[PDB]
Curated annotation (Swiss-Prot), chains A, B:
GO BP, one annotated term: innate immune response
Disulfide bonds: 1-125, 17-62, 38-44
Cellular location(s): Secreted; Cytoplasmic granule
Domain N-acetylmuramoyl-L-alanine amidase: start-end pairs: 23-151
Native source organism of the sequence: Camelus dromedarius
Function field: Innate immunity protein that plays several important functions in antimicrobial and antitumor defense systems. Acts as a pattern receptor that binds to murein peptidoglycans (PGN) of Gram-positive bacteria and thus provides bactericidal activity. Forms an equimolar complex with heat shock protein HSPA1A and induces programmed cell death through apoptosis and necroptosis in tumor cell lines by activating the TNFR1 receptor on the target cell membrane. In addition, acts in complex with the Ca(2+)-binding protein S100A4 as a chemoattractant able to induce lymphocyte movement.
Gene from which this protein is expressed: PGLYRP1
Name under which the protein is recorded: Peptidoglycan recognition protein 1
One GO location term (cellular component): extracellular region
Length: 166, 166
């Protein structure tokens, strides 16, 4: 639908998450992982594994906190997906939003156009299959939480999206 | 609809092609390039460049022969696009079909799943866009010309596709 790398394909741990999103979801929060960057399918599968591993092993979460991840390889990586409440924007925003995270620190870098396309494609695919509302609003992670996520450069770009609302 | 690496991004020569297809197109013909494979955006852009180079510079065509190329990087590379007649299946099929080529040789190799997902998603976007019929039919290159394209491993795969008609 949006050429999503399925969890099994990036060697993900089984989720234990039970809490469900009330589709059709109104909000999208854009974060960065503030993790390593990756620009090949091989490297970006490993980074998704690395991110999930911190969340599950270290923070003791039911799964990677993000609904989806974006690599500089220009592929979307399935996280908790369309139906399961995320852990990415704190308790107010988690239950009423889909969290997508660009894999990297984008304070002093931009994602490549292909990473940006993958995210816009993902969200359309969201609306297409009825997971996101037609009129969904995109928010920066820093617009709902005290953080520099998604990074100054990435935040500047998402500000220009037709669906962005400060 | 969907994510596609635009011509400018893989540094395509300007097309000189003028003949248009009639929407909606009924047939998709799946080929392999029988060339080098690539599994990173950087290598797959270069490879799209190399295929265009052979077609334009050596064969004397107006553009890369295919409507779209599939990389093992999991990205779709824009060729002639949805509206412009290609040069991939000969004078009887070129006027009535969309030509998509997997970059590589699939005689012994199967394309990775992300290359296969990129291909199927592209076709759904063609239907979404009105470029392809809802009831479009998928052909192997070898079903419409005397060739080994799209290679035995890939051919075996596209025969499993819901829209595949020998
Ligand atoms: Cl938790």
């Amino acid at each position: 639908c949006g050429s999503i790398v399925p969890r099994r394909e990036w060697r993900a741990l089984a989720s234990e998450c039970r809490e469900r999103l009330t589709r059709p979801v109104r909000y999208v929060v854009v974060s960065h992982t503030a993790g390593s960057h990756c620009d090949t399918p091989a490297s970006c599968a490993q980074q998704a594994q690395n991110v999930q591993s911190y969340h599950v092993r270290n923070l003791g979460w039911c799964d990677v906190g993000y609904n989806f991840l974006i690599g500089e390889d220009g592929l979307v990586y399935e996280g908790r997906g369309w139906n399961i409440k995320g852990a990415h924007a704190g308790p107010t925003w988690n239950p009423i939003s889909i969290g997508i995270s660009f894999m990297g620190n984008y304070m002093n870098r931009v994602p490549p156009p292909r990473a940006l396309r993958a995210a816009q494609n993902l969200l359309a695919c969201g609306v297409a299959l009825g997971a996101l509302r037609s009129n969904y609003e995109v928010k920066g992670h820093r617009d709902v939480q005290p953080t520099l996520s998604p990074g100054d450069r990435l935040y500047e770009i998402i500000q220009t999206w037709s669906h962005y609302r400060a």
